Amino acid sequence: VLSEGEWQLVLHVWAKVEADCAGHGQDILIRLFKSHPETLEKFDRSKHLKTEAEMKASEDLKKHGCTVLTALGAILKKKGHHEAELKPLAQSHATKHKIPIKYLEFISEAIIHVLHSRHPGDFGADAQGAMNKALELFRKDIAAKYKELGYQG
């Protein structure tokens, strides 16, 4: 459903993200927690971090942020053909972590904010629109997998 051109814009900016996995990952989570503090409660250890500096200095948050981006990167490189990649992720996020689709919207917003902040020249209107569609596709498909597992989140 995304055009080839749009996928290229997505993967163009993603190569930039990959130049600093920990950094982008960290800032996305920090942004998420700031914009939607209720999300922080999902994180057993990061829950207890009281300042921005503490979060910035957290190897936990760096490694988890990078883990999120690494999994998302693999999904986006499938260019929509991500049925296999979504299976274990829907399982864990539906039944174990219990992350509502709204929370995936929240983190999608965080991703777009961080990418625009760090890469404005490589993330203008068309690039943002393409990333928006890619993440919308992600959320739609993972929502369907949620329901197959009995989770109406």
Q: Summarize as ranges the residues that interact with ligand HEM (CB under 6 A).
A: 39, 42-43, 67-68, 71-72, 89, 92-93, 97, 99, 103-104, 107
- Return all residues near 74 (Cβ < 8 A) that are at least 6 apart: 85
Residue (68 or 127) nearer to ligand HEM, CB: 68
Contact 145, 94 (CB under 8 A): yes
How many angstroms from the chain centroid is the CA of residue 115?
Answer: 11
Q: What's the min distance (Å) between Cβ of 112 and ligand HEM?
A: 12
Give rounded-to-5 percent helix, strand, coil for the chain.
Answer: 80, 0, 20
- List Cα–Cα distances, 44 to 25, 91, 110, in angstroms: 18, 20, 20
Q: Which of residues 9 and 32 has its CB atom nearest to ligand HEM in the complex?
A: 32
93 is in an annotated binding site: yes
- Compute the least distance from the CB of residue 104 to ligand HEM, in Å: 6
Minimum distance from residue 100 beta carbon to ligand HEM (Å): 8
Taking the complex as a whole, how short is the minimal distance between the CB of residue 13 and ligand HEM, in angstroms? 15
In the bound state with ligand HEM, the residue whose beta carbon lies nearer, of 121 and 134, is 134
- Among residues 105 and 122, whose Cβ is nearest to ligand HEM? 105
With a CB cutoff of 8 Å and minimum separation 6, the contacts of 44 are none
Binding residues for nitrite: 64
Binding residues for O2: 64
Binding residues for heme b: 93
